[PDB]
Amino acid sequence: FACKTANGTAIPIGGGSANVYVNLAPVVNVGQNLVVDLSTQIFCHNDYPETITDYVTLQRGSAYGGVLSNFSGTVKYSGSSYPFPTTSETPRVVYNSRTDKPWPVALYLTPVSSAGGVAIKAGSLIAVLILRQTNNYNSDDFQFVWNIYANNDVVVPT
Numbered sequence: 001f002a003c004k005t006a007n008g009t010a011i012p013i014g015g016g017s018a019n020v021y022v023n024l025a026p027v028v029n030v031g032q033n034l035v036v037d038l039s040t041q042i043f044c045h046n047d048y049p050e051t052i053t054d055y056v057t058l059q060r061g062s063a064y065g066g067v068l069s070n071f072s073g074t075v076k077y078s079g080s081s082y083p084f085p086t087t088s089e090t091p092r093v094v095y096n097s098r099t100d101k102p103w104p105v106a107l108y109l110t111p112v113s114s115a116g117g118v119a120i121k122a123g124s125l126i127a128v129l130i131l132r133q134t135n136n137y138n139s140d141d142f143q144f145v146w147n148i149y150a151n152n153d154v155v156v157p158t
């Protein structure tokens with residue numbers, strides 16, 4: 001089991017950490033959501049699906065910088081909503097193919113009432129999302145840590 005972003009940035013068998021740069025809607029209105037959809041950038045696969053089934057959760061999610069200060073949010077994992085920062089571990093998603101499939105995580109972030117102007121700065125750390133992988137074969141229990149950075153500024157009008 002291993003993961004990557006499609007520009008080639010990989011986290012190999014056994015886990016590790018990687019950085020992900022996300023394009024963000026440059027204008028987000030109060031009352032509406034900034035959607036940081038990591039399922040369009042983070043992909044994973046099972047290396048031996050004929051023998052082993054892999055199980056993948058969102059173990060931990062938290063916000064940083066302007067996301068932490070200027071937005072409040074939830075995280076959707078595999079079709080369901082959870083508080084952000086996360087509390088419980090999510091249900092597992094099964095990975096059973098050598099063909100990469102997305103890690104189905106997205107943040108839904110709405111500006112706080114006092115937000116206005118440049119609310120997220122280009123280059124800043126905005127989130128850390130941790131994927132936990134286990135399987136039905138042995139005791140492997142690996143963390144894939146995704147450090148999420150803003151590729152661009154986000155402005156909240158007014």
Ligand SMILES: OC[C@H]1O[C@H](OCC#Cc2ccc(-c3ccccc3)cc2)[C@@H](O)[C@@H](O)[C@@H]1O
Pocket residue numbers: 001002013014045046047048049051052053054134135137140
């Ligand atoms: O994505 C599948 C697995 O890939 C990595 O482990 C590599 C392996 C293996 C493997 C395959 C077959 C056997 C095997 C042993 C005895 C008899 C038959 C098959 C043992 C280990 C590692 O990332 C595991 O955590 C993950 O579940």
